[PDB]
Design a binder for this molecule. Structure first.
Ligand SMILES: CCCCCCCCCCCCCC(=O)O
Ligand SMILES: CCCCCCCCCCCCCC(=O)O
Ligand SMILES: CCCCCCCCCCCCCC(=O)O
Ligand SMILES: [Co+2]
Ligand SMILES: [Co+2]
Ligand SMILES: [Co+2]
Ligand SMILES: [Co+2]
Ligand SMILES: [Co+2]
Ligand SMILES: [Co+2]
Ligand SMILES: [Co+2]
Ligand SMILES: [Co+2]
Ligand SMILES: [Co+2]
Length: 583
C-alpha cells in the first residue's frame, strides 16, 4: 500500500466505514445531486479501491486521494449545470483544485426540511431496505451539514441503527422511538454547532484565547499531569483544530490518530481513565479521548494561595513568561476545579492577570494582591446562583411550564425576535434545564456551558443573518467569557411597540386534542409568545389567568362532541375575555 493510499485507507478503515465516508464526503461537496447518483459514485470508487488492495500497481491506484477524489468530482455531468464555477476548479493542479472545491461548499444549503416519516413506515423500511434506509440519512444529514466531521457522523449513524433495533420490536414503537430520535437529533445538532463555534472562536478571537480555553479544559480532564505535558497537548490540540477547520479531513484524521497515539502511549503521564478509549480502533479512539471522564485529582492539593499569593516571586515569575505563569495559574486552578465552567476559569485568570497588572506596579505588591481569591467568589456565585434559581424553578414547573416561563421572560426582553426563534430557543433552553438539573451540583456548571454555548451560538448565527436587535448583536459579537453574562444581563424592552391583534393568531381547532405532545405544545407556545408580543405590559397573574382560561377551554372542547363548534364559539369568547382582561 506504499504505492496506493486508497488501499492503505480501505484497510485502515472497514469497507463499511469507507463506503460511508465516501458517501458522506460526496454529499458534503455536491449537496444538490440526488442519492441514487451518489450511491453510484460510491460503488465506482469502492470497486476501484479493492482493485488497488489486490494490486497497488494497478493504474490510478498510485494517485493521491486528493487527486483521485477531484478526478471523481469532475466525472459528474451536472457539475457545470448545478455547481457552476465549481467545475472550473477541475482545470487546476490538485493543491489549488481541492482548496477550490472546499470554497464552494454552501455553509447553509437551501434544501427542504427533512420530514420524519411515521414509525410504521420507517420500521418497515429498516427491515425491507436497511442499507438504503441508513445511507439516505447520512446523505440527508451530510448535505445539510457539509463541514461536519465525517467520522463523528459515522458514530451518529450507528446509534441510529440501535434505536430501530430496540424500538421497532416493541409494543408501542412510537412512544419508544421518537424521544430517542429527537435525542440523537439534539445531540447531533449540538455537535454540529460545537464544531462551528470551535472553528469560529479560533479566528474571531486569538489563538491565545483558544490555547487558554484548551489549557483549562484539559487540566480538568487530566489533573494528574505536569504543566509541561498539558502545555504540549494544548499545542498539538491547537494544531489539529486549526487544520480540521481548514477542512482537509485526511490530514485532520491523521493528526488526531497521531495525537491519540501520543496520548495512549504516555498514558500513565496523562490520565487513568484513558485505557478503555485507548483500546478502541482508529476513528473511535480519538472520539473517546475527547469524551473521556475527568480523572481524579491527587489527594494532596497544595494551596494555590502559597504560589500565587503569600509569596515574593509572584511578581518576579510573572514578569518573565507571564503567559506561562498565567497558564500555570490556570492549569493549577483548573484541575482543582473540574466542576467549574471553562468560561468561568478563564474569567478568573483574566482577573488574576488584571490583578497582577495593577499589583506588580504597586508599592506593596503583597498586600495589594492578598484578596484576589476573594475577587473570584462573586464570579463563582453568579453562574452558580443562576444554576440554582433556574433548577429550582424547573423542578416545580416541570419541563413544559419551565419552557413557558422562559418564553414569557425572553419575549419581553427581546420582543423583536421572530416567534419561531423565541419558541425554538426557549424549548431548547428547557432541555438544558432537563439535561443538566439531573446532573449533581458539582457537574451542573460544565453541563450548562456546553448546551448554552450551542443554543446561544445557533441563535447568534440565525439573528446575525436576519438582525432585529442591538442588544442580541452586542452579546453575539463579544468575548466567549462575556457572551453568556451579556445575555443574562438583558432586560425588558420598554420601547417596544405592541403588535397588532389578529384573531387567527388566537384561533384553535380540534386537531390539537389528539395531536402529539411536542406539536401540540408548540402550537400553544407560539400563542404564548404571540400573546406576550401583543400584550407585553401584562402581569404574570394576568397572563396566568388567561393561560388558566385557555387551558380549561381546551380540556373542555376536547371532551366535547362537535368540538369544532366548541373551539370556535369558546375561542371567540376566550379571546374576547382575554382582550378585556389585558386591555
Ligand atoms: C435558561 C437555561 C436553564 C438551565 C440553567 C441555566 C443556567 C445559566 C447560568 C450558568 C452558565 C454556565 C456557564 C458559565 O459559566 O458562564
Ligand atoms: C432571543 C432569545 C434569548 C435567549 C437568552 C439566553 C440566556 C441564557 C442564560 C440564562 C440566564 C437567565 C435568563 C436571563 O435572564 O437572560
Ligand atoms: C388577548 C388575545 C387573545 C389570547 C387568547 C389566549 C391565548 C393563550 C395561549 C397560551 C397557551 C397556554 C399554555 C398551556 O396552557 O399549555
Ligand atoms: Co505496498
Ligand atoms: Co495507515
Ligand atoms: Co424479518
Ligand atoms: Co441541522
Ligand atoms: Co491533504
Ligand atoms: Co500537517
Ligand atoms: Co499575607
Ligand atoms: Co453529563
Ligand atoms: Co435599545
Amino acid at each position: 500500500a506504499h504505492k496506493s493510499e486508497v488501499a492503505h485507507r480501505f484497510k485502515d478503515l472497514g469497507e463499511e466505514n469507507f463506503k460511508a465516508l465516501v458517501l458522506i464526503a460526496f454529499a458534503q461537496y455536491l449537496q444538490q445531486c440526488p442519492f441514487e447518483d451518489h450511491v453510484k459514485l460510491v460503488n465506482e470508487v469502492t470497486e476501484f479501491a479493492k482493485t488497488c488492495v489486490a494490486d497497488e500497481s494497478a493504474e490510478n491506484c498510485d494517485k493521491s486521494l486528493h487527486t483521485l477524489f477531484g478526478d471523481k468530482l469532475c466525472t459528474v455531468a451536472t457539475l457545470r449545470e448545478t455547481y457552476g464555477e465549481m467545475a472550473d476548479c477541475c482545470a487546476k493542479q490538485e493543491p489549488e483544485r481541492n482548496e477550490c472545491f472546499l470554497q464552494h461548499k454552501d455553509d447553509n444549503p437551501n434544501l427542504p426540511r427533512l420530514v420524519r416519516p411515521e414509525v410504521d413506515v420507517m420500521c418497515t423500511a429498516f427491515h425491507d431496505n436497511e442499507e438504503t434506509f441508513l445511507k439516505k440519512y447520512l446523505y440527508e444529514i451530510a448535505r445539510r451539514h457539509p463541514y461536519f466531521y465525517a467520522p463523528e457522523l459515522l458514530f451518529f449513524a450507528k446509534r441510529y441503527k440501535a434505536a430501530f433495533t430496540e424500538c421497532c420490536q416493541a409494543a408501542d414503537k412510537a412512544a419508544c422511538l421518537l424521544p430517542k430520535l429527537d435525542e440523537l437529533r439534539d445531540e447531533g445538532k449540538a455537535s454540529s454547532a460545537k464544531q462551528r463555534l470551535k472553528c469560529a472562536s479560533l479566528q474571531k478571537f486569538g489563538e491565545r484565547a483558544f490555547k487558554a480555553w484548551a489549557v483549562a479544559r484539559l487540566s480538568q480532564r487530566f489533573p494528574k499531569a505536569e504543566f509541561a505535558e498539558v502545555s504540549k497537548l494544548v499545542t498539538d490540540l491547537t494544531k489539529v483544530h486549526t487544520e480540521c477547520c481548514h477542512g482537509d479531513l485526511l490530514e485532520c484524521a491523521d493528526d488526531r490518530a497521531d495525537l491519540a497515539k501520543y496520548i495512549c502511549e504516555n498514558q500513565d503521564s496523562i490520565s487513568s481513565k484513558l485505557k478503555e478509549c485507548c483500546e478502541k480502533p482508529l476513528l473511535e479512539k480519538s472520539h473517546c479521548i475527547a469524551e473521556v471522564e475527568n480523572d481524579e485529582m491527587p489527594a494532596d492539593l497544595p494551596s494555590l494561595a502559597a504560589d500565587f499569593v503569600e509569596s515574593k516571586d509572584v511578581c518576579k515569575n510573572y514578569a518573565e513568561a507571564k503567559d506561562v505563569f498565567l497558564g500555570m495559574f490556570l492549569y493549577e486552578y483548573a484541575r482543582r476545579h473540574p466542576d467549574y465552567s471553562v468560561v468561568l476559569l478563564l474569567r478568573l485568570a483574566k482577573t488574576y492577570e488584571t490583578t497582577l497588572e495593577k499589583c506588580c506596579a504597586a508599592a506593596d505588591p503583597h498586600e495589594c494582591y492578598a484578596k484576589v481569591f476573594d475577587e473570584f467568589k462573586p464570579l463563582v456565585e453568579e453562574p452558580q446562583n443562576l444554576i440554582k434559581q433556574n433548577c429550582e424553578l424547573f423542578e416545580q414547573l416541570g419541563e413544559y411550564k419551565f419552557q413557558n416561563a422562559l418564553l414569557v421572560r425572553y419575549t419581553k426582553k427581546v420582543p423583536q425576535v421572530s416567534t419561531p426563534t423565541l419558541v425554538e430557543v426557549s424549548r431548547n433552553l428547557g432541555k438544558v434545564g432537563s439535561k443538566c438539573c439531573k446532573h449533581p451540583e458539582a457537574k451542573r456548571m460544565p453541563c450548562a456551558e456546553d448546551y448554552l454555548s450551542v443554543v446561544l451560538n445557533q441563535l447568534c448565527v440565525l439573528h446575525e443573518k436576519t438582525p432585529v436587535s442591538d442588544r442580541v448583536t452586542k452579546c453575539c459579537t463579544e468575548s466567549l467569557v462575556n457572551r453568556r453574562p451579556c445575555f443574562s444581563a438583558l432586560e425588558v424592552d420598554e420601547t417596544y411597540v405592541p403588535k397588532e391583534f389578529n384573531a387567527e393568531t388566537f384561533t384553535f381547532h380540534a386537531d390539537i386534542c389528539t395531536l402529539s405532545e411536542k406539536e401540540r405544545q408548540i402550537k400553544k407556545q407560539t400563542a404564548l409568545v404571540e400573546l406576550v408580543k401583543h400584550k407585553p405590559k401584562a402581569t404574570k397573574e394576568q397572563l396566568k389567568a388567561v393561560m388558566d382560561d385557555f387551558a380549561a377551554f381546551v380540556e373542555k372542547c376536547c371532551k366535547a362532541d362537535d368540538k369544532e363548534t366548541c373551539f370556535a364559539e369558546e375561542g371567540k369568547k376566550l379571546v374576547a375575555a382575554s382582550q378585556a382582561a389585558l386591555g
